[PDB]
Structure 1
Amino acid sequence: SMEQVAMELRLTELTRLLRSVLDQLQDKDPARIFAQPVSLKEVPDYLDHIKHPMDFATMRKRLEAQGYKNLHEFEEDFDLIIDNCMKYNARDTVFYRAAVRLRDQGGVVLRQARREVDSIG
């Protein structure tokens, strides 16, 4: 149908915008601490602690399959990155501190993303 196509163009355009959002958030992680999944070879107990691991590469796979239906879903995954790290790592660690700085800097980007998603519909 023509309606299905229209919906699909909407999803494509959201994917476009979320790709730009993802790039901007990932620039706030210049250390690349959140770039890839925590290695279960190197942290073998990880899944005993963290039930829903997340990282920027995993988000990018989902994004490119157009697997984010709305901004809420994409924010859920970004918050997992931060929140997982802040639980597994102690406050005095470079990992925890990286997550705090990513959350704080990311907030700005996400604030305007929400306005754009609502504005453009």
Structure 2
Amino acid sequence: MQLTPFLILLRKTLEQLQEKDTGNIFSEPVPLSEVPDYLDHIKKPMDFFTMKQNLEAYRYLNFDDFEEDFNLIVSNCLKYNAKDTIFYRAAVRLREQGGAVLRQARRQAEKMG
């Protein structure tokens, strides 16, 4: 830990995004055991555990890169699932609530060098 304000802002933001996912639907990768066709449709799977792993290998260099991976969690879920599903509805709610989180977090990242 050589802690930096930007990396700390990303950690905090990631925690706030995960609090919005109250069902833990997006906490871990979509399980290929349960969803065998998932990678026929989804080129770049993403989830909050993969984001946490990326964060702590310093792969997020700016706020936009981090935001892009969050947006993949949502877009993959809307692409794969039918509208009338728990997963689709959850992704729409996460889009709304997560968007509010990232809007706030971006303002901080803008004050930051």
Q: How many residue pairs were aligned?
A: 112
**Cα deviation code 1:29-65 (max 9, x no counterpart):** 0100000001112111111000000000000000011
CA contact (8 A) 1:34 1:56 kept: yes
Deviation at 1:12, TM superposition (A): 2.8
Q: CA RMSD in A?
A: 1.2
SS in 2 for 1:120: coil
Per the alignment, residue 89 of structure 1 pairs with 81
SS in 2 for 1:69: coil
Q: Tell me the amino acid that sits aligned with residue 30 of structure 1.
A: T
Larger radius of gyration, structure 1 or 2? Answer: 1
Unaligned runs of 5+ in 1: 1-8
Of 41, 52, 55, 2:44 maps to 52
- CA–CA distance in 2 between the matches of 1:37 and 1:94? 16
Is 1:29 aligned to 2:21, yes or no? yes
Deviation at 1:13, TM superposition (A): 2.2
**What does residue range 7-86 of structure 1 map to in structure 2 within 5 Å?**
12-86=4-78
Identity of aligned residues (%): 64
User: Structure 2 length normalisation: TM-score?
Assistant: 0.94
- Structure 1 segments of 4+ aligned residues over 2 angstroms from their partners: none
SS in 1 for 2:104: helix
